[PDB]
Amino acid sequence: MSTLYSTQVKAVGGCSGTIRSEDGILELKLALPKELGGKGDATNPEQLFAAGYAACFGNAVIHVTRSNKIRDNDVEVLSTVGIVANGNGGFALTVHLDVTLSGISQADAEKIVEQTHQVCPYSNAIRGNIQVSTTVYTK
Amino acid sequence: MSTLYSTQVKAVGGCSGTIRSEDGILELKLALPKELGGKGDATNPEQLFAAGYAACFGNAVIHVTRSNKEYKIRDNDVEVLSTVGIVANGNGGFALTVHLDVTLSGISQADAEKIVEQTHQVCPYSNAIRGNIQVSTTVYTK
């Protein structure tokens, strides 16, 4: 199948640097978090991943819902992205998702979230390398 | 065991909604891009992943190089352009495509290729997607 949408982001200046999308829309400063001895002044790869995953997973829920018989405003995702030390003195990403769906039964929410992980390109991207944990809430 | 750093982002309102880190540091509007029939006003998951990866990879180059002690590549010696696409997969869902253009300053073409190959083994984003996405990489010097 052919690519539906493609975008480019340039990163310069290292841990302290900037990201800028090639059209200029998204531009921001990066900082090492304080936990890694930086200023915590600005965003970082972990937070950008959390943001993208939270948005991607919420959109994927609506893709699932339109395939079958829930609105955009019935869906909330909280991504918790962490960094854990591996053996060889590098880092691995961890991910926990809190998914809140309004107006649906506990059973239906569990089914929708399971199917959403099969649709969501972030989930498909990281499967087997990051064990994503998910908690499903209803409201 | 320990988590060294953890961060939380809330997303509401769908592809035209918002994300907000719990510490308020990151706050931005989402839009559907023009290629998909939206205003293309604002960011989206492909652009956020391209930004996170480009940043993470360039940082891993610096971490790797910190004691390749010979050229000692600095912050301004590394540029990463990530190209991220979304495509239908076989199966009712979507996959990302990732291409990186890595440009390193002040080092030989052969040294740059070796450094990039090492940093893919150390980069948390590269390690996260291995076996699911075939990342393609083009290495440049200047």
End-to-end CA distance of chain A: 38
- Identify the CATH class of A45-138: alpha beta
Give the DSSP H or E segment for A66.
Answer: helix A45-66
Backbone dihedral angles phi then psi of residue A80, each to the nearest 5 degrees: -110, 110
CATH architecture, domain B45-141: 2-Layer Sandwich (3.30)
Q: Name chain B contacts of A91, Cβ cutoff 8 Å.
A: 4, 124
Backbone dihedral angles phi then psi of residue B105, each to the nearest 5 degrees: -95, 140
Per DSSP, the three-state class of B95 is: strand
Enumerate the domain spans of chain A.
Answer: 1-43, 45-138
What are the Cα distances from residue A11, in Å, to A15, A23, A80, B81, B107?
Answer: 10, 14, 23, 6, 19
Bridge partner list, B3: A84
Bridge partner list, B16: none
- Structure-token match 């107006």, residue found: A103
**Residue B86 corresponds to which tokens in the numbers above?**
């979304």
What are the respective helix, strand and coil percentages of chain B, to the nearest 5? 35, 35, 30
Question: CB distance B130–A127 less than 8 Å?
Answer: no
* Cα–Cα distance for residue pair A100/B1, rounded to 1 Å: 28
Bridge partner list, A7: B84
According to DSSP, residue B22 is labeled T
- Identify the CATH class of A1-43: mainly beta
Fold of B1-33: N-terminal domain of TfIIb (2.20.25)
Give the DSSP H or E segment for A19.
Answer: strand A18-21
* Cα–Cα distance for residue pair A127/A98, rounded to 1 Å: 18
**Where does chain B show beta strands of DSSP type E?**
3-12, 18-21, 27-29, 78-88, 94-104, 136-141
Chain A contact for B122 (CB, 8 A cutoff):
yes
**Residue B27 corresponds to which tokens in the numbers above?**
């706050």
Closest CB to A83 among B4, B8, B53: B4
Taken in order B96, B11, A43, A26, the sign of the CA dihedral is positive
Closest CB to A8 among B12, B40, B82: B82
